[PDB]
Structures are given as structure tokens and as C-alpha cells.
Amino acid sequence: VNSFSGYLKLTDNVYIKNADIVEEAKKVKPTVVVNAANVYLKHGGGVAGALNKATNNAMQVESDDYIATNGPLKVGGSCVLSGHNLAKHCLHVVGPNVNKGEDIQLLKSAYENFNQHEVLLAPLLSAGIFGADPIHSLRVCVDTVRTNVYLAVFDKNLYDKLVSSFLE
Ligand SMILES: CC(C)[C@H](Nc1ncnc2[nH]c(-c3cnn(C)c3C#N)cc12)c1ccc2c(c1)NC(=O)CO2
Numbered sequence: 001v002n003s004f005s006g007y008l009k010l011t012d013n014v015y016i017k018n019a020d021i022v023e024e025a026k027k028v029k030p031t032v033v034v035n036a037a038n039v040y041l042k043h044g045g046g047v048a049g050a051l052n053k054a055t056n057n058a059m060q061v062e063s064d065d066y067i068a069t070n071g072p073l074k075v076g077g078s079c080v081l082s083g084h085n086l087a088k089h090c091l092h093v094v095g096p097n098v099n100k101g102e103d104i105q106l107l108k109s110a111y112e113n114f115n116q117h118e119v120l121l122a123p124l125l126s127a128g129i130f131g132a133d134p135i136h137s138l139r140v141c142v143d144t145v146r147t148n149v150y151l152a153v154f155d156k157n158l159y160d161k162l163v164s165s166f167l168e
Contacts, residue, residue: 018159025086033087034122039072076109099131
């Protein structure tokens with residue numbers, strides 16, 4: 001149904017909210033929820049672990065079957081799979097992990113995957129333990145994505161910092 005509510009409008013197509021992406025998926029029933037994935041789709045921590053646990057491991061079982069037959073994704077790439085009980089589809093997107101020395105330049109390619117979907121509920125790519133500067137990740141999102149993106153950032157201080165920085 002895509003019933004998003006309580007978001008701050010940053011640009012004509014980018015919205016942000018201080019919220020857990022899992023709770024937003026349950027409330028919104030979006031057509032697409034984005035997972036902040038790794039190349040072998042191992043959903044142990046961060047956003048991926050939170051989405052997988054909310055599907056009672058159904059996401060991991062599906063992802064393991066996909067990987068066994070197709071092999072790993074590339075950094076900056078994506079994969080559409082079932083959204084299970086959270087969404088119609090899950091778009092698994094691999095942002096670069098700069099704490100593991102991956103190229104930050106690939107974050108544009110990661111967000112470019114969103115342009116295949118009219119509307120998406122998504123997290124901030126490459127932020128948290130992936131190590132990118134969260135203000136830079138929001139700028140790449142705004143400059144790259146042309147479709148409607150609703151960003152859920154589950155940290156009040158980080159949310160207030162991104163909004164404040166964007167309004168400068
Ligand atoms: C920047 C953070 C605010 C963001 N985290 C989140 N953002 C939005 N909804 C969230 N729910 C939870 C949650 C819910 N339950 N649990 C046990 C967790 C956890 N962990 C976490 C979460 C974040 C964390 C790690 C990341 C990425 C983004 N991006 C990447 O590319 C990979 O690494």
C-alpha cells in the first residue's frame with residue numbers, strides 16, 4: 001500500500017525519518033524494501049540481521065539458495081528477491097564497506113539500483129559499521145536517486161545531524 005507517514009521532505013523525491021526500517025516495513029507494507037547487504041547475502045548484523053529476524057529467517061534461507069546457484073553479487077550491485085512478510089520485494093543492495101577498504105566511489109552505483117523502482121523504503125547505504133560518512137551517503141542518495149525514496153535512520157542523534165547538515 002506504500003502508506004508512508006511522519007517523514008521530513010528533503011527534496012521533491014527524498015524523504016527521511018528517525019525509525020527502525022523493520023517497524024516502517026510492518027506499518028507501510030511497501031512494494032520494495034531495500035536491504036543493506038554484503039556480496040554473499042549473509043544477513044547477520046545491522047539492517048540485514050534486523051530484516052532477516054523479522055522474516056523468522058525466511059530471507060536467509062531464500063538468499064542461501066540464490067547464492068548456491070548464482071554466486072555472490074558485486075559491490076555496487078543488487079538483487080531482487082521476495083520481501084516475505086515485510087514487503088512485496090526485497091532489493092538487496094551492496095554498498096562499499098570502507099572499513100574493509102572497499103572503494104567509496106561505488107556508493108553512487110549502489111544507489112543507482114534504486115532508479116529501477118518507483119518507490120522504495122530504504123536504509124542509509126554504507127553507513128554504520130560499513131564506515132562511510134553518513135552525510136556523504138545522504139548526498140550521494142539525493143544526487144543519484146530520481147525515484148521516491150523514504151529513508152529510515154534508526155538513530156536519533158544521527159538523524160538530527162543529517163537533517164541539520166542538509167539544511168545548511
Ligand atoms: C546507520 C544506521 C542507523 C543503520 N541502521 C539501521 N537503519 C535503519 N533501520 C535499522 N534497524 C536496525 C535494527 C533493528 N533491530 N536491530 C537489532 C537493529 C540493528 N542493528 C538497524 C537499523 C545502518 C547500520 C548498518 C549498516 C547500514 C546502515 N548500511 C549498510 O550499508 C550496512 O551497515
